[PDB]
């Protein structure tokens, strides 16, 4: 059988996604709003754009997929898709929107910058977290 | 029947505006203080100004006109407080603050700003930066 | 009745200066602490200086009346609890009044009054904005 | 009778030093320890120095005069706070210069008056 | 018997590294997930890389031995132990051999001593701000 | 009987030690860790370095005989602490503070903080005096 990771065609692994803590990722709802308030016009094109675009793409509609099947349930349902699948859905439309803003590179040193500073206990900690930038 | 978007000839949408969270908005008794304060001369003139200022001055009305229906309700007739609340008064809260902002600051650095912040307020606390985004020229 | 606006003729208007909250003014008494400490002298001269000098020194000497009054009505009402009630009226409506008069004449002078009408504005719409949304620090006035 | 004031030869007067509030102004005893810290060389000179060492001298004797007659705690708060403001007033014109200390004084004075919330984080600063 | 200094031939000594106060360091599962993040494919990489890369997979390593003999004993017949004082050491160790490969070892060494300076100072008399790694 | 001033030699007087308040100086141990930690092989060298190595190899020394004579109940440890513990306390701090920053720095910075931990909260600066060369 297959083993693909999403986020080796962008340079990066499951496993560094998830050096980040399940805490810093926002919820599905305002990364997918995020999405739209960012990027409907590119999200909807009939071009290409680009592989994050393309993989943005899927994500939501796949989402999309698990939430109408959750929804169509009925509680107990939904509470499954959120719990398991949601964080896996909140690093992968974390990665892809905020590559497309900031870009991959930038995105990576600041993925790596926050793992370590969340990780230093807060009596040597600095005041101010790492901040994403151009 | 027609489907007008109230910020589409100001170049944003109606969607756009509901990216900010609904404690963003400043209240509706305070930005007509401030539409007031900052532009009367103009807003009262006979002169158009600006399509921010004749849109500005519909709204201003209207919310009068909304607020004279309910009134004239109660006083001649409490749930109503509290659709107006969720209903009609986020609706023109968005709005005054739309004009208001764009009438100082420019209509792109509004746009910008109400993206950043929106991006911003949706970090948990645990990673976003501990000053907002600002408005400014 | 007339109609006599006391910012007019300084070029602002009441309505522009209470667009300030009242928890933004300082006490009366601070105030006239800080006319006398900064303008003393020439609230004393007998030269007019400027029209918020002349301003200035009626404010000063009204609240002084309105101050008489009060010390007179308490001194001479036998309704005794009343007398909370009747100083409240001069702290909750009169004192305002003075509050800001004093705040706008003394900042004028110090500051000019491009600098305090703009410096208003931008407080008001500072504390205006929710919580979430101000920045931490409100616009100063300075020259 | 005779109206003298204590600040009036050094170019200030009473009711400047009091535009500053009361829990404005350091405690005796720490006013005490640091015109010792700063100062007690020239204190204990037999040359005059400065009028603020001479003013200074004085203030500091007759303050042990004051505290062996008491040993009136409001009372203690009332000419207390009279040498907190003399003692440093010239302890600070002698480090900082009178105009220095002048300046600061009305800044700080208009800045504390500001209601909590209009007025600037970081007070004003003496400096040099 | 030997006297061997782990940090002797890293240019630091045992006494050096506890000088840092033991809340400073991070938990060796925070220390292990960053080693892995930042230099699994040197770790696990056939060169010898640098004298830091050898000891980090040695200590690493023998972490993983310390854990399944304290584990082996829940399971087979304590833990707590393993926890403080073998944990303090790893920790040390651990933190001081990533930080040397990103950083360098002068900074490393440097930032410790302030570090230990500043968090010594009475919270009256010490700079809000901490010293941070650059 | 003698008057010596362990501080006169070093510039300073034991009045201008105190004018720092006693919560300022860091722990007796937390300062012995240090001088360990930054000038152990000075300490231990057959060399006389400096006249403040000199000094703070006998106040090391001086606080061990002392510390085995105060654990040789609580008004034991209260007035150690408060009359011996601070003197030592003190003294640490200045040599070690000098043989890092230098005595003009140090002095300067005493007087600094003395002053500023005296103003009231109402009108101190937020952020206090630091040392640096
Ligand atoms: C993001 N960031 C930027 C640095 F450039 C500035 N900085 N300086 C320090 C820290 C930071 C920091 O967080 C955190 N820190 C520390 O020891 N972190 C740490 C070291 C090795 C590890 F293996 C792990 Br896990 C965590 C205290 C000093
Ligand atoms: C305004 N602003 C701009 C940057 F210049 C500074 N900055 N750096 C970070 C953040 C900010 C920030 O707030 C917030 N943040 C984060 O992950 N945000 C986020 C990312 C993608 C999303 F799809 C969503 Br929803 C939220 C932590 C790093
Ligand atoms: C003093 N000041 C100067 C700006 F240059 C910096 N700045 N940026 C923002 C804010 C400020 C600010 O307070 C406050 N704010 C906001 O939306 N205010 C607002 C806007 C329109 C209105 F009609 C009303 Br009422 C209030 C958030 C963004
Ligand atoms: C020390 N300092 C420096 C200024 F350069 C900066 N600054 N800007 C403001 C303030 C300051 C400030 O305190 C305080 N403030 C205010 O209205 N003060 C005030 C004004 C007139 C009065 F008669 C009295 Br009584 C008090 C808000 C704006
Ligand atoms: C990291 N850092 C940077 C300094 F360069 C600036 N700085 N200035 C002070 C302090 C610092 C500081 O901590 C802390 N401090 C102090 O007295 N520390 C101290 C001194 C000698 C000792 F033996 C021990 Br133990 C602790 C108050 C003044
Ligand atoms: C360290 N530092 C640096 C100054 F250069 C800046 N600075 N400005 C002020 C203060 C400071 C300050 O602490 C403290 N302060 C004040 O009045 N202190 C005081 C004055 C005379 C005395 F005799 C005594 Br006792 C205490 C308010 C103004
Ligand atoms: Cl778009
Ligand atoms: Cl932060
Ligand atoms: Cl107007
Ligand atoms: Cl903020
Ligand atoms: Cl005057
Ligand atoms: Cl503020
Ligand atoms: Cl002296
Ligand atoms: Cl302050
Ligand atoms: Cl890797
Ligand atoms: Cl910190
Ligand atoms: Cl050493
Ligand atoms: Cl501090």
């Given at each position: 059988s297959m083993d693909i990771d999403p986020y080796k065609e962008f340079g990066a692994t499951v496993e560094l996604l998830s050096f980040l803590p399940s805490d810093f990722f926002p919820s599905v709802r305002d990364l997918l709003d995020t999405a739209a308030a960012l990027y409907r016009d590119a999200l909807e094109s009939?071009?290409?754009?680009?592989?994050?675009?393309?993989?943005?793409?899927?994500?939501?509609?796949?989402?999309?997929?698990?939430?109408?099947l959750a929804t169509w349930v009925g509680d107990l349902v939904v509470s499954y898709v959120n719990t398991n699948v949601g964080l896996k859905f909140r690093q992968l439309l974390w990665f892809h929107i905020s590559c497309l803003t900031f870009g991959r590179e930038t995105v990576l040193e600041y993925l790596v910058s926050f793992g370590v500073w969340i990780r230093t206990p807060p009596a040597a900690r600095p005041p101010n977290a790492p901040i994403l930038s151009t």
């Amino acid at each position: 059988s297959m083993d693909i990771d999403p986020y080796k065609e962008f340079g990066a692994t499951v496993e560094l996604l998830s050096f980040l803590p399940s805490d810093f990722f926002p919820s599905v709802r305002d990364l997918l709003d995020t999405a739209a308030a960012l990027y409907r016009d590119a999200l909807e094109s009939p071009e290409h754009c680009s592989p994050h675009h393309t993989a943005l793409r899927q994500a939501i509609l796949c989402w999309g997929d698990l939430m109408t099947l959750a929804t169509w349930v009925g509680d107990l349902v939904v509470s499954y898709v959120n719990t398991n699948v949601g964080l896996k859905f909140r690093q992968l439309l974390w990665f892809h929107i905020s590559c497309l803003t900031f870009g991959r590179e930038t995105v990576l040193e600041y993925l790596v910058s926050f793992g370590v500073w969340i990780r230093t206990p807060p009596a040597a900690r600095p005041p101010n977290a790492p901040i994403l930038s151009t």
